[PDB]
Amino acid sequence: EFTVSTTEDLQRYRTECVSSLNIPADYVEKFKKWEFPEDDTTMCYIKCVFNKMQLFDDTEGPLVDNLVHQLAHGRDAEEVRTEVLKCVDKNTDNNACHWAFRGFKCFQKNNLSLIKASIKKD
């Protein structure tokens, strides 16, 4: 089942991906600041994190229902879906790392932020 990711999920996934991909220390510092070079190391890191957040599958590609759940904060879901779908394409160069990262870049361009604050009516 799909659950939305928080900052703490992201921190755990970063740690796991850094370990499993043997990411160099200097990349880790950038990643902690949410700064992402457009190189293979970084693109495969983004795929790894999106995999773990169930936002991207290496065969099916971007996972739209899950992305909408992650992005919408329970509001304007059909509008969010419209925006997400603009960012969905096929694996045109047969590199799942590039595929995932292309999605991410399109999210950034369209102001679709996967990790946002939430105000709770207490």
Residue numbers in the entry: 2 to 123
Copy text verbatim from the article accompanying this structure deposition.
AeOBP22 is unusual in that it is expressed in multiple chemosensory tissues, including in the antenna, the proboscis of the females, the thoracic spiracles, in the male reproductive glands where it is transferred to the females during mating, and in the salivary glands.
Other compounds can produce the same magnitude of NMR chemical shift changes, notably geraniol, citronellol and benzaldehyde. We saw no evidence of any significant dimerization over long periods even at the high concentrations used for NMR chemical shift assignments (600–700 μM).
